[PDB]
């Protein structure tokens, strides 16, 4: 059962790291929203 316990803890760590990288990519995309509105590209801003 130790292999499945290791796999469940590894899956929880992978989901936590996925949440961390998605919260980082949210800030990156918001910086890109600001740069696209400063350049005047509204379709790029909506993407």
């Amino acid at each position: 059962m130790e292999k499945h316990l290791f796999n469940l803890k590894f899956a929880a760590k992978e989901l936590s790291r996925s949440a961390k990288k998605c919260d980082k990519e949210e800030k990156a995309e918001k910086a890109k929203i600001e740069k696209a509105i400063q350049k005047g590209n509204m379709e790029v801003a909506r993407i």
Partner: peptide, 27 residues
């Protein structure tokens, strides 16, 4: 709302389900 917020921050300047549900309830 996110586009409205981040366009007002740069200074560009660019309910219904209940109403339509009540109107489906009417006819």
């Amino acid at each position: 709302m996110l586009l409205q917020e981040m366009a007002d921050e740069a200074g560009l300047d660019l309910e219904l389900s209940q109403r339509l549900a009540r109107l489906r309830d009417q006819v």
